[PDB]
mmCIF file of all heavy atoms in Angstrom:
data_model
loop_
_atom_site.group_PDB
_atom_site.id
_atom_site.type_symbol
_atom_site.label_atom_id
_atom_site.label_comp_id
_atom_site.label_asym_id
_atom_site.label_seq_id
_atom_site.Cartn_x
_atom_site.Cartn_y
_atom_site.Cartn_z
ATOM 1 N N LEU A 1 104.957 -36.429 -33.938
ATOM 2 C CA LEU A 1 103.713 -37.002 -34.232
ATOM 3 C C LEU A 1 103.232 -36.586 -35.663
ATOM 4 O O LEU A 1 102.750 -37.437 -36.445
ATOM 5 C CB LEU A 1 102.662 -36.523 -33.234
ATOM 6 C CG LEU A 1 101.198 -37.050 -33.303
ATOM 7 C CD1 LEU A 1 101.175 -38.490 -33.705
ATOM 8 C CD2 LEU A 1 100.489 -36.835 -31.961
ATOM 9 N N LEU A 2 103.407 -35.321 -35.979
ATOM 10 C CA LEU A 2 103.048 -34.820 -37.285
ATOM 11 C C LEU A 2 103.825 -35.511 -38.377
ATOM 12 O O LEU A 2 103.335 -35.902 -39.419
ATOM 13 C CB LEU A 2 103.374 -33.332 -37.374
ATOM 14 C CG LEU A 2 102.258 -32.347 -37.126
ATOM 15 C CD1 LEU A 2 102.770 -31.029 -36.688
ATOM 16 C CD2 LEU A 2 101.404 -32.171 -38.396
ATOM 17 N N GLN A 3 105.132 -35.752 -38.139
ATOM 18 C CA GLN A 3 106.014 -36.424 -39.084
ATOM 19 C C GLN A 3 105.571 -37.888 -39.312
ATOM 20 O O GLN A 3 105.546 -38.333 -40.499
ATOM 21 C CB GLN A 3 107.436 -36.425 -38.617
ATOM 22 C CG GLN A 3 108.237 -35.121 -38.980
ATOM 23 C CD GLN A 3 109.195 -34.567 -38.021
ATOM 24 O OE1 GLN A 3 109.597 -33.437 -38.062
ATOM 25 N NE2 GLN A 3 109.749 -35.512 -37.218
ATOM 26 N N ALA A 4 105.157 -38.605 -38.265
ATOM 27 C CA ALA A 4 104.650 -39.947 -38.371
ATOM 28 C C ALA A 4 103.363 -39.995 -39.078
ATOM 29 O O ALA A 4 103.037 -40.840 -39.898
ATOM 30 C CB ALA A 4 104.503 -40.578 -36.963
ATOM 31 N N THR A 5 102.527 -38.920 -38.828
ATOM 32 C CA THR A 5 101.268 -38.875 -39.516
ATOM 33 C C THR A 5 101.414 -38.667 -41.021
ATOM 34 O O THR A 5 100.759 -39.266 -41.865
ATOM 35 C CB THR A 5 100.405 -37.672 -38.976
ATOM 36 O OG1 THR A 5 100.181 -37.909 -37.595
ATOM 37 C CG2 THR A 5 99.143 -37.526 -39.736
ATOM 38 N N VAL A 6 102.392 -37.804 -41.363
ATOM 39 C CA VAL A 6 102.706 -37.584 -42.794
ATOM 40 C C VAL A 6 103.130 -38.836 -43.457
ATOM 41 O O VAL A 6 102.780 -39.104 -44.591
ATOM 42 C CB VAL A 6 103.782 -36.452 -42.934
ATOM 43 C CG1 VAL A 6 104.262 -36.380 -44.366
ATOM 44 C CG2 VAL A 6 103.229 -35.078 -42.487
ATOM 45 N N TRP A 7 103.950 -39.552 -42.728
ATOM 46 C CA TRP A 7 104.483 -40.858 -43.258
ATOM 47 C C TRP A 7 103.327 -41.762 -43.538
ATOM 48 O O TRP A 7 103.268 -42.472 -44.581
ATOM 49 C CB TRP A 7 105.433 -41.525 -42.272
ATOM 50 C CG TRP A 7 106.014 -42.803 -42.825
ATOM 51 C CD1 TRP A 7 107.074 -42.870 -43.683
ATOM 52 C CD2 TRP A 7 105.607 -44.110 -42.492
ATOM 53 N NE1 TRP A 7 107.358 -44.228 -43.889
ATOM 54 C CE2 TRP A 7 106.402 -44.968 -43.185
ATOM 55 C CE3 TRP A 7 104.594 -44.646 -41.617
ATOM 56 C CZ2 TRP A 7 106.353 -46.379 -43.133
ATOM 57 C CZ3 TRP A 7 104.494 -46.006 -41.605
ATOM 58 C CH2 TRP A 7 105.386 -46.840 -42.293
ATOM 59 N N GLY A 8 102.332 -41.804 -42.659
ATOM 60 C CA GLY A 8 101.151 -42.641 -42.830
ATOM 61 C C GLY A 8 100.477 -42.308 -44.125
ATOM 62 O O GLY A 8 100.111 -43.212 -44.950
ATOM 63 N N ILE A 9 100.291 -40.994 -44.476
ATOM 64 C CA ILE A 9 99.677 -40.588 -45.650
ATOM 65 C C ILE A 9 100.472 -40.974 -46.905
ATOM 66 O O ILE A 9 99.934 -41.425 -47.889
ATOM 67 C CB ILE A 9 99.452 -39.067 -45.677
ATOM 68 C CG1 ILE A 9 98.473 -38.694 -44.572
ATOM 69 C CG2 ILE A 9 98.902 -38.566 -47.069
ATOM 70 C CD1 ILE A 9 98.480 -37.181 -44.174
ATOM 71 N N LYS A 10 101.804 -40.875 -46.809
ATOM 72 C CA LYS A 10 102.665 -41.180 -47.900
ATOM 73 C C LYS A 10 102.514 -42.708 -48.301
ATOM 74 O O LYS A 10 102.464 -43.073 -49.466
ATOM 75 C CB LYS A 10 104.114 -40.924 -47.550
ATOM 76 C CG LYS A 10 104.514 -39.449 -47.708
ATOM 77 C CD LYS A 10 106.014 -39.289 -47.686
ATOM 78 C CE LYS A 10 106.402 -37.932 -47.180
ATOM 79 N NZ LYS A 10 107.882 -37.823 -47.000
ATOM 80 N N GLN A 11 102.493 -43.584 -47.305
ATOM 81 C CA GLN A 11 102.212 -45.005 -47.515
ATOM 82 C C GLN A 11 100.944 -45.246 -48.302
ATOM 83 O O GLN A 11 100.819 -46.075 -49.197
ATOM 84 C CB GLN A 11 102.228 -45.840 -46.236
ATOM 85 C CG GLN A 11 103.409 -45.432 -45.352
ATOM 86 C CD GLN A 11 104.769 -45.431 -46.111
ATOM 87 O OE1 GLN A 11 105.447 -44.449 -46.178
ATOM 88 N NE2 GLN A 11 105.046 -46.597 -46.711
ATOM 89 N N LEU A 12 99.855 -44.506 -47.929
ATOM 90 C CA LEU A 12 98.566 -44.680 -48.509
ATOM 91 C C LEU A 12 98.652 -44.184 -49.952
ATOM 92 O O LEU A 12 98.080 -44.814 -50.893
ATOM 93 C CB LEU A 12 97.564 -43.818 -47.761
ATOM 94 C CG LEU A 12 96.924 -44.442 -46.509
ATOM 95 C CD1 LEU A 12 95.942 -43.519 -45.930
ATOM 96 C CD2 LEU A 12 96.227 -45.817 -46.925
ATOM 97 N N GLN A 13 99.356 -43.107 -50.233
ATOM 98 C CA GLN A 13 99.480 -42.550 -51.550
ATOM 99 C C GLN A 13 100.251 -43.539 -52.401
ATOM 100 O O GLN A 13 99.923 -43.698 -53.588
ATOM 101 C CB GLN A 13 100.289 -41.183 -51.540
ATOM 102 C CG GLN A 13 99.487 -40.063 -50.895
ATOM 103 C CD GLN A 13 100.365 -38.836 -50.516
ATOM 104 O OE1 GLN A 13 99.946 -37.856 -50.336
ATOM 105 N NE2 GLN A 13 101.709 -39.165 -50.476
ATOM 106 N N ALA A 14 101.233 -44.255 -51.840
ATOM 107 C CA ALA A 14 101.991 -45.220 -52.590
ATOM 108 C C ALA A 14 101.089 -46.318 -53.104
ATOM 109 O O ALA A 14 101.306 -46.809 -54.232
ATOM 110 C CB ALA A 14 103.074 -45.831 -51.630
ATOM 111 N N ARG A 15 100.183 -46.842 -52.295
ATOM 112 C CA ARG A 15 99.239 -47.811 -52.696
ATOM 113 C C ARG A 15 98.491 -47.116 -53.850
ATOM 114 O O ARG A 15 98.880 -47.022 -54.993
ATOM 115 C CB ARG A 15 98.130 -48.111 -51.668
ATOM 116 C CG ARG A 15 98.481 -49.256 -50.662
ATOM 117 C CD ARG A 15 99.594 -48.863 -49.729
ATOM 118 N NE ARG A 15 99.630 -49.687 -48.521
ATOM 119 C CZ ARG A 15 100.622 -49.713 -47.686
ATOM 120 N NH1 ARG A 15 101.720 -48.992 -47.924
ATOM 121 N NH2 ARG A 15 100.542 -50.421 -46.530
ATOM 122 N N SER A 16 97.464 -46.427 -53.344
ATOM 123 C CA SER A 16 96.569 -45.580 -54.170
ATOM 124 C C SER A 16 97.001 -44.554 -55.119
ATOM 125 O O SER A 16 96.639 -43.318 -54.961
ATOM 126 C CB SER A 16 95.553 -45.053 -53.190
ATOM 127 O OG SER A 16 95.771 -45.445 -51.881
ATOM 128 N N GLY A 17 97.809 -44.881 -56.133
ATOM 129 C CA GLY A 17 98.184 -43.898 -57.142
ATOM 130 C C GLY A 17 99.599 -43.467 -57.347
ATOM 131 O O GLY A 17 99.903 -42.806 -58.297
ATOM 132 N N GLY A 18 100.501 -43.951 -56.445
ATOM 133 C CA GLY A 18 101.876 -43.649 -56.664
ATOM 134 C C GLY A 18 102.259 -42.257 -55.973
ATOM 135 O O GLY A 18 101.348 -41.680 -55.445
ATOM 136 N N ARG A 19 103.489 -41.877 -56.036
ATOM 137 C CA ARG A 19 103.857 -40.635 -55.396
ATOM 138 C C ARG A 19 104.422 -39.558 -56.292
ATOM 139 O O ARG A 19 104.730 -38.498 -55.837
ATOM 140 C CB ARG A 19 104.825 -40.902 -54.196
ATOM 141 C CG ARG A 19 104.320 -41.871 -53.202
ATOM 142 C CD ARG A 19 104.696 -41.565 -51.775
ATOM 143 N NE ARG A 19 104.183 -40.246 -51.370
ATOM 144 C CZ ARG A 19 104.818 -39.112 -51.246
ATOM 145 N NH1 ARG A 19 106.106 -39.052 -51.515
ATOM 146 N NH2 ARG A 19 104.222 -38.046 -50.848
ATOM 147 N N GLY A 20 104.413 -39.783 -57.583
ATOM 148 C CA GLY A 20 104.885 -38.806 -58.534
ATOM 149 C C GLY A 20 104.086 -37.520 -58.447
ATOM 150 O O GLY A 20 104.706 -36.439 -58.568
ATOM 151 N N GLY A 21 102.804 -37.538 -58.340
ATOM 152 C CA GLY A 21 102.002 -36.296 -58.290
ATOM 153 C C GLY A 21 102.037 -35.577 -56.928
ATOM 154 O O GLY A 21 101.431 -34.570 -56.759
ATOM 155 N N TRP A 22 102.888 -36.152 -56.065
ATOM 156 C CA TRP A 22 102.925 -35.553 -54.699
ATOM 157 C C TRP A 22 104.201 -34.844 -54.373
ATOM 158 O O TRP A 22 104.519 -34.520 -53.199
ATOM 159 C CB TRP A 22 102.614 -36.626 -53.620
ATOM 160 C CG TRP A 22 101.309 -37.274 -53.861
ATOM 161 C CD1 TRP A 22 100.985 -38.534 -54.013
ATOM 162 C CD2 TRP A 22 100.046 -36.519 -53.885
ATOM 163 N NE1 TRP A 22 99.629 -38.762 -54.195
ATOM 164 C CE2 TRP A 22 99.025 -37.498 -54.124
ATOM 165 C CE3 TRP A 22 99.693 -35.176 -53.745
ATOM 166 C CZ2 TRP A 22 97.730 -37.153 -54.269
ATOM 167 C CZ3 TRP A 22 98.279 -34.845 -53.897
ATOM 168 C CH2 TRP A 22 97.360 -35.837 -54.140
ATOM 169 N N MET A 23 105.044 -34.559 -55.404
ATOM 170 C CA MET A 23 106.365 -33.892 -55.194
ATOM 171 C C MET A 23 106.272 -32.497 -54.616
ATOM 172 O O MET A 23 107.017 -32.180 -53.744
ATOM 173 C CB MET A 23 107.136 -33.767 -56.506
ATOM 174 C CG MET A 23 107.898 -34.985 -56.830
ATOM 175 S SD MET A 23 107.259 -35.924 -58.232
ATOM 176 C CE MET A 23 107.234 -34.684 -59.576
ATOM 177 N N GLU A 24 105.258 -31.668 -55.083
ATOM 178 C CA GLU A 24 105.063 -30.389 -54.582
ATOM 179 C C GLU A 24 104.512 -30.410 -53.155
ATOM 180 O O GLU A 24 104.900 -29.579 -52.240
ATOM 181 C CB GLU A 24 104.229 -29.598 -55.481
ATOM 182 C CG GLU A 24 104.728 -29.273 -56.790
ATOM 183 C CD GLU A 24 106.010 -28.299 -56.798
ATOM 184 O OE1 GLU A 24 106.154 -27.614 -55.790
ATOM 185 O OE2 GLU A 24 106.794 -28.379 -57.682
ATOM 186 N N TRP A 25 103.653 -31.375 -52.864
ATOM 187 C CA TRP A 25 103.122 -31.501 -51.510
ATOM 188 C C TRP A 25 104.240 -31.861 -50.580
ATOM 189 O O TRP A 25 104.360 -31.305 -49.510
ATOM 190 C CB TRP A 25 102.053 -32.642 -51.538
ATOM 191 C CG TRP A 25 101.275 -32.777 -50.222
ATOM 192 C CD1 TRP A 25 100.360 -31.982 -49.694
ATOM 193 C CD2 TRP A 25 101.478 -33.918 -49.320
ATOM 194 N NE1 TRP A 25 99.949 -32.542 -48.505
ATOM 195 C CE2 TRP A 25 100.534 -33.770 -48.279
ATOM 196 C CE3 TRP A 25 102.275 -35.088 -49.319
ATOM 197 C CZ2 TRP A 25 100.466 -34.649 -47.220
ATOM 198 C CZ3 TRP A 25 102.195 -35.927 -48.269
ATOM 199 C CH2 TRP A 25 101.228 -35.678 -47.253
ATOM 200 N N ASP A 26 105.128 -32.824 -50.984
ATOM 201 C CA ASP A 26 106.250 -33.256 -50.212
ATOM 202 C C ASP A 26 107.077 -31.981 -49.886
ATOM 203 O O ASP A 26 107.523 -31.862 -48.779
ATOM 204 C CB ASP A 26 107.097 -34.210 -50.955
ATOM 205 C CG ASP A 26 106.569 -35.619 -50.995
ATOM 206 O OD1 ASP A 26 105.632 -35.873 -50.141
ATOM 207 O OD2 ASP A 26 107.001 -36.477 -51.680
ATOM 208 N N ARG A 27 107.279 -31.154 -50.859
ATOM 209 C CA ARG A 27 108.119 -29.953 -50.705
ATOM 210 C C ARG A 27 107.521 -29.023 -49.725
ATOM 211 O O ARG A 27 108.239 -28.440 -48.896
ATOM 212 C CB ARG A 27 108.275 -29.233 -52.110
ATOM 213 C CG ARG A 27 109.180 -28.032 -52.112
ATOM 214 C CD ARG A 27 108.994 -27.195 -53.365
ATOM 215 N NE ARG A 27 109.438 -25.808 -53.114
ATOM 216 C CZ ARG A 27 108.655 -24.855 -52.822
ATOM 217 N NH1 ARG A 27 107.420 -24.992 -52.673
ATOM 218 N NH2 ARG A 27 109.260 -23.573 -52.656
ATOM 219 N N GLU A 28 106.231 -28.832 -49.751
ATOM 220 C CA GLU A 28 105.560 -27.893 -48.846
ATOM 221 C C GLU A 28 105.673 -28.457 -47.385
ATOM 222 O O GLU A 28 106.040 -27.743 -46.424
ATOM 223 C CB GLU A 28 104.056 -27.752 -49.128
ATOM 224 C CG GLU A 28 103.230 -27.039 -48.024
ATOM 225 C CD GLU A 28 101.781 -26.890 -48.399
ATOM 226 O OE1 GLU A 28 101.255 -27.760 -49.090
ATOM 227 O OE2 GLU A 28 101.178 -25.915 -47.921
ATOM 228 N N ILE A 29 105.486 -29.774 -47.213
ATOM 229 C CA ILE A 29 105.533 -30.355 -45.885
ATOM 230 C C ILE A 29 107.056 -30.270 -45.371
ATOM 231 O O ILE A 29 107.287 -29.894 -44.252
ATOM 232 C CB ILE A 29 105.165 -31.819 -45.895
ATOM 233 C CG1 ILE A 29 103.751 -31.978 -46.557
ATOM 234 C CG2 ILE A 29 105.232 -32.423 -44.524
ATOM 235 C CD1 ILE A 29 102.599 -31.706 -45.629
ATOM 236 N N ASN A 30 107.985 -30.590 -46.309
ATOM 237 C CA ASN A 30 109.374 -30.595 -45.906
ATOM 238 C C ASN A 30 109.813 -29.251 -45.547
ATOM 239 O O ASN A 30 110.602 -29.007 -44.645
ATOM 240 C CB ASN A 30 110.225 -31.130 -47.054
ATOM 241 C CG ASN A 30 110.136 -32.640 -47.241
ATOM 242 O OD1 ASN A 30 109.848 -33.365 -46.342
ATOM 243 N ND2 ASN A 30 110.373 -33.051 -48.509
ATOM 244 N N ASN A 31 109.272 -28.217 -46.265
ATOM 245 C CA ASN A 31 109.617 -26.809 -46.087
ATOM 246 C C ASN A 31 109.095 -26.379 -44.644
ATOM 247 O O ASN A 31 109.815 -25.744 -43.890
ATOM 248 C CB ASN A 31 109.069 -25.896 -47.095
ATOM 249 C CG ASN A 31 110.004 -25.906 -48.382
ATOM 250 O OD1 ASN A 31 109.696 -25.289 -49.354
ATOM 251 N ND2 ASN A 31 111.096 -26.550 -48.247
ATOM 252 N N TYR A 32 107.871 -26.759 -44.376
ATOM 253 C CA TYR A 32 107.361 -26.416 -43.057
ATOM 254 C C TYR A 32 108.003 -27.110 -41.967
ATOM 255 O O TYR A 32 108.200 -26.547 -40.791
ATOM 256 C CB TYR A 32 105.801 -26.733 -43.001
ATOM 257 C CG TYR A 32 104.955 -25.653 -43.626
ATOM 258 C CD1 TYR A 32 104.118 -25.873 -44.662
ATOM 259 C CD2 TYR A 32 105.069 -24.301 -43.167
ATOM 260 C CE1 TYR A 32 103.400 -24.847 -45.187
ATOM 261 C CE2 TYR A 32 104.324 -23.276 -43.745
ATOM 262 C CZ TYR A 32 103.496 -23.572 -44.751
ATOM 263 O OH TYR A 32 102.836 -22.529 -45.406
ATOM 264 N N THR A 33 108.540 -28.282 -42.211
ATOM 265 C CA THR A 33 109.293 -29.035 -41.225
ATOM 266 C C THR A 33 110.654 -28.410 -40.959
ATOM 267 O O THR A 33 111.079 -28.342 -39.811
ATOM 268 C CB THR A 33 109.588 -30.509 -41.735
ATOM 269 O OG1 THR A 33 108.388 -31.181 -41.918
ATOM 270 C CG2 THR A 33 110.453 -31.194 -40.718
ATOM 271 N N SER A 34 111.252 -27.859 -42.023
ATOM 272 C CA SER A 34 112.517 -27.178 -41.864
ATOM 273 C C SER A 34 112.276 -25.922 -41.001
ATOM 274 O O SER A 34 113.040 -25.494 -40.198
ATOM 275 C CB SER A 34 113.085 -26.792 -43.212
ATOM 276 O OG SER A 34 113.612 -27.906 -43.815
ATOM 277 N N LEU A 35 111.133 -25.192 -41.293
ATOM 278 C CA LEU A 35 110.730 -23.973 -40.532
ATOM 279 C C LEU A 35 110.542 -24.293 -39.066
ATOM 280 O O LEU A 35 111.010 -23.545 -38.257
ATOM 281 C CB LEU A 35 109.457 -23.349 -41.140
ATOM 282 C CG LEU A 35 109.520 -22.758 -42.491
ATOM 283 C CD1 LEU A 35 108.151 -22.349 -42.995
ATOM 284 C CD2 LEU A 35 110.453 -21.554 -42.491
ATOM 285 N N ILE A 36 109.911 -25.354 -38.818
ATOM 286 C CA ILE A 36 109.636 -25.733 -37.392
ATOM 287 C C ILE A 36 110.924 -26.150 -36.671
ATOM 288 O O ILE A 36 111.152 -25.767 -35.540
ATOM 289 C CB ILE A 36 108.600 -26.979 -37.334
ATOM 290 C CG1 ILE A 36 107.258 -26.430 -37.881
ATOM 291 C CG2 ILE A 36 108.473 -27.362 -35.956
ATOM 292 C CD1 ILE A 36 106.438 -27.492 -38.585
ATOM 293 N N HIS A 37 111.753 -26.987 -37.393
ATOM 294 C CA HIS A 37 113.018 -27.422 -36.746
ATOM 295 C C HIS A 37 113.804 -26.209 -36.426
ATOM 296 O O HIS A 37 114.483 -26.083 -35.441
ATOM 297 C CB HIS A 37 113.844 -28.301 -37.755
ATOM 298 C CG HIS A 37 113.207 -29.706 -37.935
ATOM 299 N ND1 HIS A 37 112.442 -30.289 -36.981
ATOM 300 C CD2 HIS A 37 113.481 -30.634 -38.880
ATOM 301 C CE1 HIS A 37 112.100 -31.480 -37.397
ATOM 302 N NE2 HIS A 37 112.817 -31.704 -38.529
ATOM 303 N N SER A 38 113.854 -25.196 -37.307
ATOM 304 C CA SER A 38 114.493 -24.011 -37.169
ATOM 305 C C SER A 38 114.073 -23.206 -35.980
ATOM 306 O O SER A 38 114.949 -22.718 -35.220
ATOM 307 C CB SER A 38 114.271 -23.082 -38.359
ATOM 308 O OG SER A 38 115.058 -23.490 -39.523
ATOM 309 N N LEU A 39 112.801 -23.174 -35.747
ATOM 310 C CA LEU A 39 112.257 -22.413 -34.539
ATOM 311 C C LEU A 39 112.539 -23.199 -33.286
ATOM 312 O O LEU A 39 112.756 -22.552 -32.207
ATOM 313 C CB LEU A 39 110.722 -22.328 -34.685
ATOM 314 C CG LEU A 39 110.327 -21.216 -35.698
ATOM 315 C CD1 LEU A 39 108.872 -21.388 -36.179
ATOM 316 C CD2 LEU A 39 110.669 -19.874 -35.188
ATOM 317 N N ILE A 40 112.689 -24.493 -33.307
ATOM 318 C CA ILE A 40 113.032 -25.283 -32.125
ATOM 319 C C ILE A 40 114.480 -24.916 -31.761
ATOM 320 O O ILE A 40 114.729 -24.652 -30.552
ATOM 321 C CB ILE A 40 112.940 -26.801 -32.378
ATOM 322 C CG1 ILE A 40 111.362 -27.160 -32.483
ATOM 323 C CG2 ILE A 40 113.515 -27.564 -31.263
ATOM 324 C CD1 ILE A 40 111.136 -28.562 -32.877
ATOM 325 N N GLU A 41 115.368 -24.948 -32.706
ATOM 326 C CA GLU A 41 116.761 -24.693 -32.495
ATOM 327 C C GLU A 41 116.879 -23.269 -31.972
ATOM 328 O O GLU A 41 117.692 -23.008 -31.074
ATOM 329 C CB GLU A 41 117.564 -24.806 -33.820
ATOM 330 C CG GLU A 41 118.987 -24.387 -33.756
ATOM 331 C CD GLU A 41 119.227 -22.921 -33.976
ATOM 332 O OE1 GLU A 41 118.381 -22.276 -34.625
ATOM 333 O OE2 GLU A 41 120.260 -22.366 -33.498
ATOM 334 N N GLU A 42 116.079 -22.292 -32.601
ATOM 335 C CA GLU A 42 116.103 -20.948 -32.127
ATOM 336 C C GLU A 42 115.755 -20.836 -30.618
ATOM 337 O O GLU A 42 116.430 -20.076 -29.973
ATOM 338 C CB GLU A 42 115.113 -20.147 -32.990
ATOM 339 C CG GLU A 42 115.198 -18.600 -32.830
ATOM 340 C CD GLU A 42 114.439 -17.839 -33.874
ATOM 341 O OE1 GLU A 42 113.650 -18.437 -34.568
ATOM 342 O OE2 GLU A 42 114.652 -16.609 -34.015
ATOM 343 N N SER A 43 114.751 -21.557 -30.266
ATOM 344 C CA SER A 43 114.314 -21.530 -28.836
ATOM 345 C C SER A 43 115.415 -22.120 -27.974
ATOM 346 O O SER A 43 115.668 -21.603 -26.879
ATOM 347 C CB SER A 43 113.002 -22.386 -28.710
ATOM 348 O OG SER A 43 111.978 -21.881 -29.485
#
């Protein structure tokens, strides 16, 4: 659900301003996603 929600925001950013200024944000989200996927596998 979180991933789909993030995608929704990305589409909005694409309209409204482009996504160049969102590289670091993308990185933070992607990093947290890796952390979560990691914990799921661990479980």
Side-chain angles (χ1 to χ4, degrees):
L1 181 40
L2 263 157
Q3 272 147 204
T5 295
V6 168
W7 183 79
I9 295 163
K10 280 195 208 173
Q11 308 314 121
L12 277 177
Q13 291 167 162
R15 270 67 160 168
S16 1
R19 304 217 65 253
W22 302 121
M23 274 110 59
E24 292 297 337
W25 184 75
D26 280 348
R27 185 195 159 263
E28 171 180 30
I29 308 279
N30 288 336
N31 277 178
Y32 275 122
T33 296
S34 285
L35 290 173
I36 295 146
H37 285 342
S38 283
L39 287 163
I40 287 171
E41 176 271 338
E42 188 167 15
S43 300

